[PDB]
Amino acid sequence: SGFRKMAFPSGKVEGCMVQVTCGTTTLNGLWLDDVVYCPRHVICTSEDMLNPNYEDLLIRKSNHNFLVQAGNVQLRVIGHSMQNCVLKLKVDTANPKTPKYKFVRIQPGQTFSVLACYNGSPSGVYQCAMRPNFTIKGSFLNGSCGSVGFNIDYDCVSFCYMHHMELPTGVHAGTDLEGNFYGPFVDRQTAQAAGTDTTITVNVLAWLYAAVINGDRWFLNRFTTTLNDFNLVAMKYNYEPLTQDHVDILGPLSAQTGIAVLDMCASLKELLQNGMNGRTILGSALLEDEFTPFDVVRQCSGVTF
Amino acid sequence: SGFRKMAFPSGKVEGCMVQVTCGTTTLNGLWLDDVVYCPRHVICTSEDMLNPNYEDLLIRKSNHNFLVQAGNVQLRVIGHSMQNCVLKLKVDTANPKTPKYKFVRIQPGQTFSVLACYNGSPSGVYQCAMRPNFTIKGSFLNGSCGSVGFNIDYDCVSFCYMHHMELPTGVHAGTDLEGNFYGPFVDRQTAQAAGTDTTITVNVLAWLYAAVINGDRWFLNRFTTTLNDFNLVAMKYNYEPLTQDHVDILGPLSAQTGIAVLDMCASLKELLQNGMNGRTILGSALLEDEFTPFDVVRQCS
């Protein structure tokens, strides 16, 4: 029993964290094989952040200008290239701790673990979701840039995020491991604001299924709804539309608990219109939306990595 | 900016997880140096669960009855001893991945990360606090026994918990790494119930200071209170009494935010009286009590 926000074990990712210092900027890098990946804004200082022609700035940097430190060992950079908003520093030593890995771009609603680092030193691990507005509600301080988001499938680490910046509302913006930003954000000093966020409906339903598995049933009702009628209600309460894909994905949970997806939808529909009435679901007074259907199945069935 | 429930990176603990099989029971073990630590109930049978004599059961065990598996390698047990509710299996190989570590017993309200394992294989890492009733609100399934709770001190791992059992309410009971249970619990199937839990008041205040550091101020008020008047209100909401130690511990946060502890106490009293009025504090509609004053300073500063 019990339901917690659980991150993937971070060991395989910790063995890849290095410190990248270029000029005055010191952030984290991801050392995989003989390449260190890190945000391209590391080559930026005063004017280089406001007007950043990154091809021009990078061409002025020599290999020795990048100080890469893996623990107490200094790595020597033998090349540098840029792929979108990520800098790739070729090094002379392949990381012996490189796990089996992939670079994946995740979609809004998908969850991942973040290993927050400062000075190439992992300080914490947390589970979060890619918001529908493409920001991550993270916990990051100055120096966390380069910290990565990951998932683990079997023995494969899927890298899905690299932290680049903090938006004025305290939320975070970053890129996949190919340097492509999530959302309409840029890595330059300009006025950027996160769009109005929405609730990840499929994840709220997955979390309601997890509550039923854990014995929390007060919110269940005798009613069901059409997907069209539920979506009308979801639009009204800033909830993401629920697609037929989402309904299919919730299938195993619907089978395990005996509550059809559209039946759970009518419970969610009531919760939105009537509130919790001073009651909690899994120790929370709000509807949690950062557990995907796969996370609920993984946690309530015990899949190991 | 931002405030999240953050667990310690689990890498140093993952390198210590092994599978311990004894008869039909299979649980997790913690391999540190040449010793594997695990709940002593791995030696228990069906007939020896209600009232097991562990000294008598372990004396009947031989080293070859314990199957220890570190990944794909089978470890050879060269000795066995028992320290309270923990079994210590001496092995012929010292764990090369053994980090700098300490065994620490923690107090209620203290937080730690849990690395949940199944079959000596880490499946997830989460954060939690030792409840005032000495249980942990965990997320554990069958096979998670031997999963450990830890905190990382720079390069040192302080092991503070080993999962032993699930109580009838879904909450969890375990021991420190010296086998001493937290709470009035025993490793027998006898009727055991967790006492009525209380809210960790010092942790809620630390979390309110974290909200102020993050720019959340709606809950602040012009009031202050005496420590005793705060305790009379707090106890009525099943909140732990706030001691002078707790007030001292919140000192740095009081200095950083300019809000005296007894001033924040009055904000908490108001919050307990009024509720949240459909507002959130750090993205939560309930008062969070699983962030200690130390966690808030570490995460924010």
Ligand SMILES: O=C1[C@@H](c2ccc(Cl)c(Cl)c2)CCCN1c1cncc2ccccc12
């Ligand atoms: O409770 C136990 C164990 C146990 C039982 C009784 C006594 Cl007295 C003791 Cl010392 C230990 C048996 C193995 C599994 N286990 C569990 C531990 N955590 C979460 C569980 C969730 C669901 C089912 C079992 C769980």
